[PDB]
Amino acid sequence: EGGQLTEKVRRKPFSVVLFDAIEKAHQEIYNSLLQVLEDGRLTDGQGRTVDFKNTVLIFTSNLGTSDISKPVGLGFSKGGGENDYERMKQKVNDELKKHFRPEFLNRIDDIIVFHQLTREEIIRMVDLMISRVAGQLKSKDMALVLTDAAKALLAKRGFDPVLGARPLRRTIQREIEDQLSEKILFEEVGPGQVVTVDVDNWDGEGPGEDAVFTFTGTR
Amino acid sequence: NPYNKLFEERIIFLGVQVDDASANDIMAQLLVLESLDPDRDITMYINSPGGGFTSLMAIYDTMQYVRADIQTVCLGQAASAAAVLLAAGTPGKRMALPNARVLIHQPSLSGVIQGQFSDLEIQAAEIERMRTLMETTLARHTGKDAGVIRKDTDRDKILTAEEAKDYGIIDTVLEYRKLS
Amino acid sequence: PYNKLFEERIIFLGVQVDDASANDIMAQLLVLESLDPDRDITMYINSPGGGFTSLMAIYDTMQYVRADIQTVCLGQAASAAAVLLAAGTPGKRMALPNARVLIHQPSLSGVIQGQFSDLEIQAAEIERMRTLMETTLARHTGKDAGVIRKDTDRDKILTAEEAKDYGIIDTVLEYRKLS
Amino acid sequence: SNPYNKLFEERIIFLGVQVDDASANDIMAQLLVLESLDPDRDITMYINSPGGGFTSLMAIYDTMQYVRADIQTVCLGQAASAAAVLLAAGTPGKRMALPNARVLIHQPSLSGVIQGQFSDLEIQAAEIERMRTLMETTLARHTGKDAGVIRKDTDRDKILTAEEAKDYGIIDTVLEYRKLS
Amino acid sequence: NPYNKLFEERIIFLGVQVDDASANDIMAQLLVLESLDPDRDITMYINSPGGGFTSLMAIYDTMQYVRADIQTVCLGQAASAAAVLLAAGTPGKRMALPNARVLIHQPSLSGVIQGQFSDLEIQAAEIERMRTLMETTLARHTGKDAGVIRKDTDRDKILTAEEAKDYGIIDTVLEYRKLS
Amino acid sequence: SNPYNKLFEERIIFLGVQVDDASANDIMAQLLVLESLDPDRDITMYINSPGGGFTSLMAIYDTMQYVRADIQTVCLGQAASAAAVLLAAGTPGKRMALPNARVLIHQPSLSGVIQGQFSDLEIQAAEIERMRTLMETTLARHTGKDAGVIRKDTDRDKILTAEEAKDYGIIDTVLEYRKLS
Amino acid sequence: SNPYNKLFEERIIFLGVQVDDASANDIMAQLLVLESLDPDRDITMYINSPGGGFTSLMAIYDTMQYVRADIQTVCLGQAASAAAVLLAAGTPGKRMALPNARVLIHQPSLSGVIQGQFSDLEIQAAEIERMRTLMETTLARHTGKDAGVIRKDTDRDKILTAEEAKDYGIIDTVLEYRKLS
Ligand SMILES: CC(C)C[C@H](NC(=O)[C@H](Cc1ccccc1)NC(=O)c1cnccn1)B(O)O
Ligand SMILES: CC(C)C[C@H](NC(=O)[C@H](Cc1ccccc1)NC(=O)c1cnccn1)B(O)O
């Protein structure tokens, strides 16, 4: 066997190769991948050079945020909201230079430090994650409407400014799905139209942690 | 050290005369504990005789700057600057032990500073700026009117902990966990 | 040898009660509360006392902790240290047989100057310090505070056998070997 | 590790004490090490100093101007005499101060009397005017003032609150608290 | 240290002026060696000029408290407070080197203590209580009658080791292991 | 590690303090260790000293002339008396100074009065003229002056700015900042 | 490791300070350890001392004469009385000095007045003449002089330059620099 990476790229030369959690590799596995970046070569153990010249090599790192994420920085400083992203970029790009040899980072075409998800983007993540839930209820002869007051309540309770959209995935799981999964098993919301309106309405503003979703099916 | 065990559980410790040496230590301690846990409360133990106004406002601004709420605890004495730092904790916090001695009084000059009357007009405009700032600071932390603070800190105002709670310096007098 | 004493939960007063010594003992009392809150802290007292806010810093902390405080007077408990000696738990508070317990009213070390309005307050405080020293030494000795005021009018040196009769200590500590 | 070592690990030098030959030599050692560690990441300078010392000032001043790292000066409770010049000596767009910091600018002095012949004292006075003019020239290109305004203002002790040291040009922003408390 | 090797072989070491610093060290040393071996004898080396009565009776009571017998050894000097600690060892023990200088004398006040005559009536009733206790302590350890101790410690009574054995301060004058 | 230890690891000795018997003995120990580590790599000498001491001067002076490593002297805020001679004592093509450094050259003095018979004082004065002539001879082959010019200039305190200590020959270049700031 | 520890590792004892009971006891401990480490490899002695102390002199003197290792004395900036005797006390064919070292020989003195009866002072003067004669006898078999020449020359302070301490016999060679600089 020629290795997991060298075969999958030799079968599909035009690929996107994701090296997920790249800082969790040993530091001597980057040195195998140095000439993948610069020459498009990775000669396998059998000796066949594999073409990486048509791949999109994506490395994914949490370096410089596997801690700095926590708000506030050691000491005094101006601004927050867009200077904590410049604090993010300086922290991340220094953790990359600390962790990687400078000839690895020299060979990367673009290092993109990612933004924390803003409150307006977590609202649009709700549209994207209910669509996974509603897409599963299509297979059950159901539909899932999610009212716009219920989009806002998921968006507040799912917004962590330092994790983003994975806490929202938990809130949609805890509040929509885990409540909707028993309603399917009660057969109280079988093949119909689950509307999911908010009730306490959380006044649409302020905290809404006394508010609750209600699931009713019609048609 | 036992102090290192206190700092590991996020307790800064004033302890000594508030001067440039002591203020610089506490600000270093406040910012490290902000960096370790910015959401977990820093506790501040105060057994200080006070003194020093810029050393006060160095500690004061830093414990107001940090994201962590400051739980000030007066041990035996919170005199002068120490009493302003005692009121400088978070509301719903600011304990004091039942026989603590809170002492508020107006700023002074330790010893005479000489000079021309134009030099002394400025050293007196500063000691009134220091006095007004000490009364403005001790007004939004005690709920008083600053003019009441000026009338009360006209002399030494020694407060027992039970009447530093009525004054607004502290919020609760700290009950003992065992009677003993 | 002090670290071996602190490992077996013995804080050690030893020196002049001041802001340096009170801050050490309060750090020692709270660490031993965190290590074992149910096992008794022992306090060895060989101090000449002094300092009232340093007294009431140590006093409140040894009253605050959940661990009962076993005070032991070594050779001397004077001024602030005799109040800390009485500040231990009842059924505890030992003293060695030739210990010297010295209770007396608070003083000002040296003269503090000022206007008579400044000195009216420094005297209302030294009477508040005196009344607090007599109130503290009344619920720990069982006396009536007015008896404490009449007795601490001057230096009242107590032998350990008559500091037990006074209520400062509860037992005079018998030797384990005759020698 | 000391809490100061944790500050220096996150690239915060700390003035703290009286600016003298001992304190200036420490800060210059701290400024050059942090230039060697990261020359592109900003050194932060915390200032709680009563100042004093002009050659110790200009030793710290030239070093924090020499290093490639931008200096973020932060006044803690006090920047007096030489320390207020070091506070203005930070990078523009930086130079914070806490809201109750006390910036004190005044002309150079001689601590105590220095004796000598009048030819010796003509030179010790030409130097204290060279020290004065340099202190006003330095505090002019960092505050945007005209040196003659600095000379009229540092004629006596000029105590600046942080909100009016920002209007003076000593600092650029008064440092808002992260929590209200 | 060479002192640590002595303490490892259970030798506490007086050495210095008996004060609050020195008494607190020796009591810490006496109790650790009681905890290590309560049945093996603690040896006490005394080269002290004495001084301090409550520091004396702090050391005295502790070396009487511990279960381990105390072997006191006078090195060059046991002068008041330290001569009482020298007699405070166990009978059948209490050595002294042949040119040791045992000095017993009544308690004194180092310097004048001022006060009202009611204050000084008590500071004198205490220095007589200190004197009587010093003579009572040095009577059950020397076999004398306290009144003989009072007549002998009226002034400085310097004892050679050969006549501190006749006095009852020590029990044997310590013979050299090599003649040299 | 101290920040001074990081400087010494990169071969920077540091004068810093009053040139006395304690400070001269440290620097000579530092100069000889760095000669033994790399005899061909340049020792850098940072000078923020008020000077003083002539035999402590000539102890440092002879050692930094003895070692095979070229000495790069850098004046930080001050090179006074014994320290300005050590500043000129670096290698030609070297001897930097920061732009607001204060080079102070003056003739040797006696700190306080030394008593004695006039035969004792004839010798303590023949020595202070031997110290003066040696200070002017040393500061002549390192500045290119004629010693008699050094004697006329160090008659009093001659404070040199770094830009005019370069014209004097004390230093060879005024040290440009790496960042404008 | 200190820079002094690196010098002592390469068998360089270091006088450095005022010759007193503290400094003599250190050097004798250093001389005997280096005799025990290598008795055949030369101990080097660096001397920057102002001297003082005659029994502290003769404690160092006898120990550096006792050890089997030859002593290479090197004068750094100063060898005053006591230290100049220790400088001459090195081995012949050794005893360097740096070119601007200041060798100062003079007769023993009493620092301050010692009181007493005239029978007490007859003995304190017979001792200071025994100290003087011993200082001149010691400095005669190490310089090749006649002691009476040493007595006439150390009548007052005799400051020797290193080039004329070689002509005097205190040192044997004036130490050439390894780099010109
Ligand atoms: C909180 C206020 C009342 C401060 C109190 N103490 C002061 O006023 C202190 C005492 C002091 C210390 C040094 C020099 C002059 C004066 N005031 C100052 O710090 C001070 C400093 N410079 C000028 C004017 N006042 B207190 O003792 O902390
Ligand atoms: C148990 C109580 C009485 C403690 C007593 N302590 C005192 O008398 C001490 C003596 C002292 C020390 C420093 C400055 C002024 C006075 N009292 C005080 O601590 C004190 C402090 N400030 C004002 C008034 N008294 B002890 O001496 O009897």
Ligand SMILES: CC(C)C[C@H](NC(=O)[C@H](Cc1ccccc1)NC(=O)c1cnccn1)B(O)O
């Ligand atoms: C920002 C500038 C003005 C720094 C000022 N520093 C001084 O006034 C200090 C005070 C001082 C210290 C020691 C010896 C003599 C004088 N000025 C000097 O450092 C100094 C040193 N030598 C000659 C003249 N001035 B500060 O006090 O305003």
Ligand SMILES: CC(C)C[C@H](NC(=O)[C@H](Cc1ccccc1)NC(=O)c1cnccn1)B(O)O
């Ligand atoms: C065995 C007895 C006599 C001890 C002797 N020591 C003393 O006399 C010492 C000398 C002294 C020391 C401090 C303050 C006042 C007096 N006595 C005391 O310790 C003392 C202390 N307070 C009141 C009265 N005496 B002896 O000189 O060592």
Ligand SMILES: CC(C)C[C@H](NC(=O)[C@H](Cc1ccccc1)NC(=O)c1cnccn1)B(O)O
């Ligand atoms: C050394 C040259 C550069 C000129 C200056 N030297 C001095 O003034 C110093 C000041 C001083 C120090 C100690 C004892 C007496 C005098 N001169 C000497 O080092 C000195 C030492 N012994 C005798 C004569 N002069 B400068 O360093 O202060």
Ligand SMILES: CC(C)C[C@H](NC(=O)[C@H](Cc1ccccc1)NC(=O)c1cnccn1)B(O)O
């Ligand atoms: C001449 C040589 C031997 C040394 C020179 N002078 C001495 O001999 C020294 C000078 C001195 C130093 C300190 C204290 C008292 C006296 N002589 C003595 O040490 C000395 C000691 N006791 C009695 C008499 N002279 B020089 O000062 O070291």
